Design a protein around this ligand. Structure first.
Ligand code: MGD
Ligand code: MGD
Ligand code: SF4
Ligand code: SF4
Ligand code: SF4
Ligand code: SF4
Ligand code: SF4
Ligand code: SF4
Ligand code: SF4
Ligand code: SF4
Ligand code: SF4
Ligand code: SF4
Ligand code: SF4
Ligand code: SF4
Ligand code: SF4
Ligand code: SF4
Ligand code: K
Ligand code: K
Ligand code: K
Ligand code: K
Ligand code: K
Ligand code: K
Ligand code: MG
Ligand code: H2S
Ligand code: W
Lengths: 429, 80, 129, 348, 267, 80
């Protein structure tokens, strides 16, 4: 047995880089320090389909093909397509994402990542009002008040609290005892159970609650005696806790991006954090989901100028979320072909989008059996980033960390698959 | 007598107990600062294969800190 | 019964997706609906019984589970997945992001069976190409 | 090609053509007086029993209109004292069309005379009036100085308890070895303080300095109160009973009514079932309570000043102990002779 | 004067046709109009490939009136940045109708998609049917939006109409959904029907009038009382309105919401 | 049309409706004073064999007083 240390975990945006992998043959048989989810990715569950070779279905049933045939037919679909959708990206590394941008440019495609079903609304909000953030270490070493707003880290970022709240930092040497922990959620989540304050507000009224809080913050009277199910008196007491912070951090998640108002819930939250800096240092961090969703928006931004929902059909890059987003093209029946990489929209898009996936050619660069492969025409299996392939990923607050290669795989990496698909798309055009 | 008992089937691997424990903190600065141990250390429990795993129960002083830090009652102080 | 449908994460649904969405584990973790025990009593069902969820946008059959994370009165929880996404609201309001959370649904007891993962997707009727 | 749409308890009858006609009935505004059914030239309207529709739960609408008989002339709409029937033509409501006779009524408030006492808002049997008023802030009707010496203060809480307006606030806490005190601050909210002097008299260590200036400096530091606001009479909820006119202490409200008539009550036929009292949309009818024991009162008391002679009480009474006469119906000029016969047929 | 575009059956992959405007049609024969470039997905194509073209040429855009006599539900950006003239669409349109418009007028006889009149500067847009999101909105990230013009929607609109408005006038005769007037700075919004929630969210200036019912409102607004007989941007309003000033979550906010008294007592 | 309907199977025979009815009261001083009729009278309804019994539905003016006075909804104004 051998123990490989300092491994970076390829699941969620916490992007822990202290994982120990237990390697036996050439295979990862156990972990240390990784949480229950991260461990499940590193280890193979027996009875689980791990595609060993590309597949193509013959109107109704899948047959094994070679890499060159699968890549070739995939290139033909994208070359002939007039509005191809290239979606996913969040669970692979940045060098593959960069090739994807060039390929989307070459195919006149719209390229988009899981941000469009995730923190896309935070992207729209931050473009309109701003983005006051910090890195995890400032939270650990300085944070006096820690808020989890509409996110459930114990189930979705399991080690997030232990690394940022219970940790003993430079100016917070007593860890959990040095911080007031606040959670905002209509459910009594296991994250809420650990809180000093739990605002169990009415669902989809965050925007109303944040409007009252900010009016209070700027010295105004709160119109109604109860807002979002929270009594006026406790609105102000909550604003006083935030005003009296020495260093506050607002972690927020899907409870306010998926809710009514979507990006405008993030908008009002950001502007409160900004204005609070006249009374107390305050900052925010979106709880980005996958380990490298942040990386795609970084790569796509610096190459093209825009972070997601990027449409190259006209040559120039153009950007209108609400127009050029994965769900918009599918539900409005604009997309005439779709390439999925490192994502599962078959499992995780709404019914109305899947209706369109049923009618169009679907390419899936995917290692495992999923609802998307069940809706797929071509399946191309890759080496998995973080276990069998290396590359850069970006943590939820922008910190870049290189994913490590722990064991060998005979399958091709995403980037090599994408470089060959780009080669053939040009040949046809 | 009352001692530390783990319920791995309920555990998330979140690590709050590992970090919160003062014995662990005292012995491993990485644990004190919220990280999983990378250096070789003898501590009371760690997260291993995704769940809590008790390694040195004799070092446990039964203070109750880890129990408070777990929201899903996966680590406890009970008889035996 | 009219209830508000909320959806999202679970440690077991995360373990399941990284173990394999083709496995039975995933059905057990994601083809479920979490309810407060008082709500189960009022509709007359126990843990393990199945429920028919109907919305303006679709329908699904999921297995009832007692919520260990208590819910507000009138709310139920379906973990993210293709079962939840049969019924939640697809429209993005010109933001690209669907309304995955807090959707009015109708829930009803049923003797129908939970559809496993490959059977569930056939409802969308994939045509080969 | 006429149509009838039923939305809830409301009824819409529409006919399309070069001239689009539509008759809209709003159940919630209907007082079930019956006048529409009587005036209808083609007997297209059936009005359900007044008492039952007011005192009991019913799923039926208060009236029924027959599509096949209705000629959409709009007499029922014209006569309706409660604005529950509106005929629209090329969609403009007939009340704005001079071709259609209109019942003459009005309800007005002289806002310059009005002093915003709000009696009419309370008195209005239809909640048709909104009266707003902006009072001065408390701080501006009062004058003084007050300051608390926090070093002298021992945080006994006696002033906080005694303060009759809760103007004093103490930041209580449980002591710790790091902070061995039972409170960390004390404050007076001068937006609330009315300078009564209680706190300073109760203070055990004379830590509060307080001076009231009202009597010597009130002429200069306290501005004379001048109370603003406005009025609004909802024209569709309004029914011209005149309660506001009669309740107004400064005669700022004026009301004119559509019908002239009388109310006639037979006290011995009346058995005081209270139906007409509950039915009356203008609060004309009441059961006076005797003031002293042994005293007797008139069984059913009226005040015709508030009466509009819609006839709903008479219609609701199962022993016809109450009857309504109607001498005059004031309208804009009528040219059609059909319209003049319908309006005169409602006179008695 | 009159140039007729008869649309051929519309493709599943939408068209973008910024050049369908009097400005471009001016001074061209029918054949040259047949050759105007439009987009269809990632292909550059000709307008003639999707429209039959008849009518009379004219050299000045003031004298040209374009008629699209048929449904064009899948063509975007019609009339974009037009300066003068007239467009009439006898059917539905997709997104961005009249985006960036400077002058002239567009009439849509059916529905319009999102971003109708986005970044409007002058002229008129009339939509006889329903509209989408972001009527008279700004563009992503920009804090300067619509600065002039008039948009009239006879049906209903949805979310964030008048987003970051900075001048001009929007009239929705029907209902809207949520966040009308979000981040408004200046201008006039009149909603004759109902509003679900968050009218005037985070507005700094301007005026929003609601003649129907707001189901919910916002605690950052201060109630000023009632005003009768109001006059706003040349529009005469009868009746009484509850008057609110906000949104005081924003510093220095001077925005005004008027809500009709008859249906807003709960506000 | 809306009319008076008796539900004798729910009826208590308590007599509140008979006394409350103004038509009955006007017609029988004993009923007006809360007694069951002893003199022969023609009234709208009586309690007979322990339950409410409608005798003269044509004199009913459907005012609703009886309904308000019955706690068990044994007498009603409804269709037919
Ligand atoms: N186990 C597991 N972990 C994951 C993932 C996974 O699939 N499984 N995926 C990853 C991804 S992609 C992401 S984006 C993150 C997501 O992590 P989160 O942002 O936590 O997303 P959710 O858990 O879906 O929802 C967060 C909470 O919002 C609450 N909520 C619902 N409605 C409202 C509301 O109106 N207001 C407020 N304030 N809250 C509300 C719900 O109760 C829920 O607990 O997790 C990542 N981690
Ligand atoms: N009802 C509901 N639905 C939702 C949500 C919700 O809260 N509620 N949340 C939405 C959100 S936030 C998101 S982000 C989506 C989830 O977004 P998804 O992308 O659907 O998340 P996963 O299911 O984890 O998909 C990741 C896939 O990539 C594969 N993969 C892993 N490593 C690699 C690699 O190295 N290369 C390649 N090519 N593939 C790899 C894995 O096998 C896995 O199938 O769900 C959305 N849908
Ligand atoms: S937390 Fe997110 S990252 Fe750190 S381990 Fe558990 S999963 Fe892998
Ligand atoms: S008990 Fe006190 S000591 Fe024994 S573990 Fe939990 S914490 Fe470390
Ligand atoms: S025990 Fe409770 S806490 Fe210690 S890890 Fe398992 S879960 Fe996180
Ligand atoms: S008239 Fe008397 S009854 Fe006929 S409608 Fe107007 S109100 Fe209802
Ligand atoms: S309109 Fe002329 S006809 Fe049609 S109902 Fe009212 S009255 Fe009878
Ligand atoms: S009107 Fe006469 S009554 Fe109604 S308010 Fe002005 S004053 Fe008080
Ligand atoms: S009383 Fe004198 S002392 Fe006791 S509190 Fe009020 S002030 Fe401080
Ligand atoms: S003065 Fe009268 S009011 Fe002002 S504080 Fe002392 S007590 Fe409360
Ligand atoms: S009297 Fe002396 S104290 Fe009493 S009020 Fe006039 S001033 Fe203030
Ligand atoms: S008149 Fe009768 S109704 Fe019209 S207002 Fe004065 S009171 Fe209210
Ligand atoms: S009058 Fe006819 S109705 Fe009014 S009370 Fe005497 S009886 Fe009951
Ligand atoms: S009383 Fe005068 S007003 Fe009250 S109802 Fe009988 S009639 Fe209509
Ligand atoms: S009916 Fe209702 S009331 Fe009249 S008797 Fe039978 S029960 Fe007593
Ligand atoms: S309804 Fe009015 S009348 Fe007919 S019975 Fe019951 S009470 Fe006597
Ligand atoms: K695995
Ligand atoms: K515990
Ligand atoms: K009828
Ligand atoms: K007090
Ligand atoms: K008077
Ligand atoms: K009853
Ligand atoms: Mg903008
Ligand atoms: S994500
Ligand atoms: W996500």
């Amino acid at each position: 047995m051998e123990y490989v240390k300092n491994v970076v975990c390829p699941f969620c945006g916490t992007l822990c880089d202290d994982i120990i992998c237990k390697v036996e043959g050439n295979e990862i048989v156990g972990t240390i320090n990784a949480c229950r989810i991260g461990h499940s990715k590193f280890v193979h569950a027996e009875g689980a389909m791990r595609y060993k070779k590309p597949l193509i279905r013959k109107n109704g049933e899948f047959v094994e093909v070679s890499y060159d045939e699968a890549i070739d037919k995939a290139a033909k679909i994208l070359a002939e397509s007039k509005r191809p959708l290239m979606y996913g990206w969040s669970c692979t590394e940045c060098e593959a994402q960069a090739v994807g941008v060039e390929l989307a440019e070459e195919a006149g495609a719209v390229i988009d990542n899981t941000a469009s079903v995730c923190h896309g609304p935070s992207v729209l909000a931050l473009q309109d009002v701003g983005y006051p953030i910090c890195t995890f270490g400032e939270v650990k070493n300085r944070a006096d008040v820690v808020v989890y707003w509409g996110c459930n880290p114990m189930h979705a970022h399991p080690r997030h609290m232990s690394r940022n709240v219970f940790a003993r930092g430079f100016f917070r040497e007593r860890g959990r005892s040095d911080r007031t922990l606040i959670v905002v959620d209509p459910r009594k989540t296991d994250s809420a159970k650990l809180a000093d304050i739990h605002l169990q507000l009415d669902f989809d009224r965050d925007y109303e609650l944040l409007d009252a809080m900010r009016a209070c913050l700027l010295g105004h009277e709160i119109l109604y005696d109860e807002v979002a199910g929270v009594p006026r008196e406790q609105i102000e007491e909550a604003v006083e806790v935030l005003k009296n912070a020495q260093f506050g951090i607002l972690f927020f998640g899907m409870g306010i991006t998926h809710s009514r108002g979507k990006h405008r819930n993030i908008d009002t939250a950001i502007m409160m954090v900004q204005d609070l800096n006249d009374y107390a240092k305050w900052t925010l961090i979106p709880m980005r989901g996958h380990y490298n969703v942040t990386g795609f928006n970084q790569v796509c931004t610096w190459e093209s100028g825009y972070p997601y929902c990027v449409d190259f059909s006209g040559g120039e890059p153009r950007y209108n979320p609400g127009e050029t987003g994965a769900n918009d093209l599918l539900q409005n029946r604009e997309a005439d072909a779709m390439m999925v990489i490192a994502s599962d929209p078959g499992a995780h898009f709404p019914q109305r989008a899947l209706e369109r996936m049923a009618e169009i050619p679907v390419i899936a660069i995917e290692p495992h059996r999923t609802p998307t492969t069940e809706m797929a025409d071509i399946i191309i299996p890759p080496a998995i980033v973080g276990m069998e392939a290396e590359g850069t990923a970006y943590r939820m607050e922008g910190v870049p960390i290189r994913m490590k290669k722990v064991v060998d795989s005979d399958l091709l990496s995403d980037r090599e698959i994408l470089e060959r698909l780009l080669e053939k798309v040009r040949e046809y055009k | 007598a009352i001692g530390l008992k783990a319920y791995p089937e309920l555990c998330h691997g979140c690590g709050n107990c590992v970090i919160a424990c003062p014995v662990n903190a005292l012995r491993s600065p990485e644990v004190a600062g919220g990280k999983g141990p990378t250096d070789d250390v003898e501590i009371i429990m760690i997260v291993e294969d995704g769940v809590v795993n008790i390694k040195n129960p004799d070092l446990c002083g039964k203070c109750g800190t880890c129990v408070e830090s777990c929201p899903v009652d996966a680590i406890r102080l009970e008889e035996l | 019964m009219r209830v508000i449908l909320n959806t999202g994460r679970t440690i077991w649904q995360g373990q399941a997706i990284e173990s394999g969405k083709d496995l039975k584990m995933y059905v057990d973790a994601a083809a479920i609906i979490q309810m407060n025990p008082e709500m189960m009593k009022q509709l007359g069902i126990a843990e393990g019984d199945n429920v028919k969820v109907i919305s303006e946008y679709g329908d699904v059959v999921v297995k009832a589970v007692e919520a260990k994370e208590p819910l507000p009165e009138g709310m139920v929880y379906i973990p993210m997945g293709p079962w939840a996404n049969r019924v939640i609201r697809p429209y993005t309001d010109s933001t690209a992001t669907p309304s995955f959370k807090n959707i009015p649904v109708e829930i009803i007891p049923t003797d129908e069976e939970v559809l496993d993962m490959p059977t569930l997707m056939k409802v969308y009727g994939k045509v080969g190409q | 090609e006429t149509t009838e749409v039923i939305e809830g308890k409301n009824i819409t009858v529409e006919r399309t053509g070069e001239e689009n006609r539509r008759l809209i009935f709003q159940d919630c505004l209907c007082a079930v007086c019956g006048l529409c059914g009587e005036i209808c030239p083609v007997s297209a309207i059936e009005v359900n029993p007044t008492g039952a529709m007011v005192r009991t739960e019913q799923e039926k609408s208060k009236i029924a209109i027959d599509e096949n008989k209705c000629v959409l002339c709009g007499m029922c709409s014209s006569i309706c004292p409660f604005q529950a029937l509106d005929l629209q033509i090329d969609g403009t409501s007939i009340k704005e069309l001079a071709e259609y006779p209109k019942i003459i009524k009005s309800a007005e408030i002289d806002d310059e005379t009005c002093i915003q006492c709000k009696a009419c808002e309370t008195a209005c049997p239809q909640d048709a009036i909104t009266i707003t008023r902006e009072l001065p802030e408390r701080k501006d009707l009062v004058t003084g100085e007050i300051e608390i010496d926090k070093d002298t203060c021992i945080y006994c809480g006696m002033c906080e308890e005694m303060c009759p307006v809760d103007a004093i606030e103490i930041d209580h806490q449980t002591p710790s070895s790091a902070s061995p005190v039972v409170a960390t601050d004390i404050r007076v909210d001068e937006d609330k303080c009315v300078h009564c002097g209680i706190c300073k008299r109760i203070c055990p260590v004379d830590a509060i300095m307080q001076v009231c200036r009202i009597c010597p400096y009130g002429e200069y530091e306290i501005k004379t109160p001048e109370v603003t606001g406005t009025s609004y009479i909802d024209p569709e909820l309004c029914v011209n009973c005149g309660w506001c006119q009669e309740i107004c202490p400064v005669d700022a409200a004026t009301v004119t009514k559509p019908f002239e008539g009388e109310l006639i009550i037979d006290q011995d036929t009346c058995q005081a079932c209270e139906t007409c009292v509950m039915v009356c949309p203008c609060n004309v009818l009441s059961f006076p309570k005797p003031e002293k024991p042994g005293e007797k009162t008139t069984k059913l008391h009226k005040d015709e000043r508030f009466c509009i002679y819609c006839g709903a009480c008479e219609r609701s009474c199962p022993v016809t102990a109450i009857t309504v006469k109607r001498n005059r119906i004031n309208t804009t000029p009528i040219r059609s002779k059909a319209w003049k016969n319908a309006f005169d047929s409602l006179l008695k | 004067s009159e140039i007729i575009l008869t649309p051929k059956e519309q493709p599943e992959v939408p068209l973008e046709a910024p050049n369908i405007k009097p400005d471009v049609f001016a001074g061209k024969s029918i054949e040259e109009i047949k050759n105007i470039q439009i987009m269809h997905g990632n292909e550059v194509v000709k307008l003639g490939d999707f429209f039959e073209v008849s009518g009379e040429p004219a050299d000045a855009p003031e004298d040209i009136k374009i008629i699209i006599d048929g449904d064009v539900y899948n063509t975007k950006r019609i009339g974009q940045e037009m300066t003068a003239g007239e467009i009439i669409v006898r059917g539905n349109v997709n997104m961005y109708v009249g985006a960036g418009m400077k002058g002239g007028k567009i009439t849509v006889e059916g529905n319009a998609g999102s971003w109708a009149g986005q970044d409007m500067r002058g002229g008129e847009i009339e939509i006889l049917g329903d509209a989408g999101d972001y009527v008279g909105s700004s563009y992503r990230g920009d804090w300067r939006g619509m600065s002039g013009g008039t948009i009239t929607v006879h049906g209903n609109a949805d979310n964030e109409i008048g987003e970051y408005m900075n001048g001009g006038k929007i009239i929705i005769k029907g209902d809207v959904n949520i966040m009308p007037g979000i981040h408004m700075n200046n201008g006039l919004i009149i909603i004759e029907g109902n509003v679900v929630a968050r009218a005037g969210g985070e507005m700094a200036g301007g005026t929003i009038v609601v003649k129907g019912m707001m189901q919910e409102f916002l605690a950052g607004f201060k109630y000023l009382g009632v005003e009768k007989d109001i006059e706003v941007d040349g529009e005469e309003l009868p009746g009484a309105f509850y008057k609110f000033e906000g949104d005081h979550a924003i510093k220095g906010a001077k925005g005004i919401v008027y809500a009709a008294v008859g249906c807003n007592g709960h506000i």
